Design an enzyme around this catalytic site. Structure first.
Site, short mmCIF file in Angstrom:
data_model
loop_
_atom_site.label_atom_id
_atom_site.label_comp_id
_atom_site.label_asym_id
_atom_site.label_seq_id
_atom_site.Cartn_x
_atom_site.Cartn_y
_atom_site.Cartn_z
N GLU A 190 -21.07 -2.65 35.29
CA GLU A 190 -21.91 -3.91 35.68
C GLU A 190 -21.65 -3.86 37.22
OE1 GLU A 190 -19.96 -6.99 33.08
OE2 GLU A 190 -21.89 -7.17 32.11
N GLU A 234 -19.29 -9.97 21.06
CA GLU A 234 -19.24 -8.93 21.95
C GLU A 234 -17.77 -8.67 22.56
OE1 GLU A 234 -21.16 -9.36 25.69
OE2 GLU A 234 -21.37 -7.09 26.10
#
Lengths: 222, 222
Positions: free
Chosen positions: B203, B120
């Site tokens: 986030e 990622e």
């Protein structure tokens, strides 16, 4: 500030870049004034036919251009040692000139400090007037997140690959290696070639006074 | 507009991207509202401790994320067939939330449409609060013309390489392959891997309502 009207006069700014009047294609007066972070075209008399070469290429550069190397440049540097070659620019445009605002990025198989470099990459940030790049249009390409019309051809002493913006770009930060990779991908350079200079300025065909490079940066990360 | 409050609810925008509430790490209500060009966080209750995982990752994506593939995506695509993977974003930030604004770019050795992807890449466009990326800081890197602090580590199910902006970036257009190349250069992917999704969102650890993705684009040039 430093004013230069000699056709081939140059000076240095920020202890690292060279500002060049570079009035190679006109006999009428042209002057540039180097500032702390770039330069302005302060006189640019005369007109050159738009189907031919421009009058000049007043510009600022990092690297070596015909023996003239900016103070403490890391170029020429071999391309496979470069992790990144970031460059940034802030352009000042004016409405009564026929010109392009362009970067000239030169690549060569040798660590060339003088003489004609093998391949030239041109990035047109703005175009005013019936002018076009060297060569012919070969389609579009996405480089650095933006879309460009690509041209390729040979200008005389060497090969030229141009990336033209659809509309004016007054300021941008980008990685010069993205355009180098697109050039390598079209067969006009190889990964172990050298980046010999990164220049930005204007090619004016008519007038040009008022055009400016408000700020410029060019570094290499190895 | 379409409002989604179900934790795992999704919808599609512009006939090509998926908007996901993705409220995997909180039990308090969170909703997103998909717009024509992106989405907004319209409720995001609760607070998660800043030394742990965030509450969620409300986001928009091109590609395949746990079986959910955006309409007509070209991903997963093999990286050596990609000339460019341009993406653009316009973020809307607000002042009373603890969060990051980030892209999640997933790469894998297989054309993965489901299941955890191997590596990622995270790109932090903004950070408000005492939060930090997965892993530890490994130095800076110039990617796409901008300077980033890089972090690497393993988040649990996989490896994560994060590129953090020094100050808020509210809008940018860039080539996702530039970050992929920086990841390949750090040994966390190879050139014949697959790009499986390009996601962007937030986030949030505390609050989050008001945060928005005003516009997003993600394509692949082969």
């Amino acid at each position: 500030d430093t004013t230069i009207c000699e056709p081939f006069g140059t000076t240095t700014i920020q202890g690292r870049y060279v500002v060049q009047n570079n009035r190679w294609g006109s006999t009428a007066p042209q002057c540039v004034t180097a500032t702390d972070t770039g330069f302005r075209v302060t006189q640019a008399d005369g007109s050159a036919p738009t189907n031919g070469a421009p009058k000049s290429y007043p510009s600022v550069f990092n690297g070596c251009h015909y023996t003239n190397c900016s103070p403490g440049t890391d170029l020429p540097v071999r391309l496979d040692t470069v992790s990144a070659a970031p460059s940034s620019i802030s352009y000042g445009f004016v409405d009564g000139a026929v010109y392009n605002a362009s970067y000239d990025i030169w690549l060569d198989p040798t660590a060339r400090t003088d003489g004609v470099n093998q391949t030239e990459i041109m990035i047109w940030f703005n175009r005013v007037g019936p002018i076009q790049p060297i060569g012919s249009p070969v389609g579009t390409a996405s480089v650095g997140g933006r879309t460009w019309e690509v041209w390729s051809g040979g200008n005389g002493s060497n090969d030229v690959l141009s990336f033209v913006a659809p509309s004016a770009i007054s300021g941008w930060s980008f990685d010069v290696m993205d355009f180098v990779r697109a050039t390598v991908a079209r067969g006009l350079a190889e990964n172990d070639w050298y980046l010999t200079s990164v220049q930005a300025g204007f090619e004016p065909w008519q007038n040009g006074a008022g055009l400016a490079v408000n700020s410029f940066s060019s570094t290499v990360e190895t």
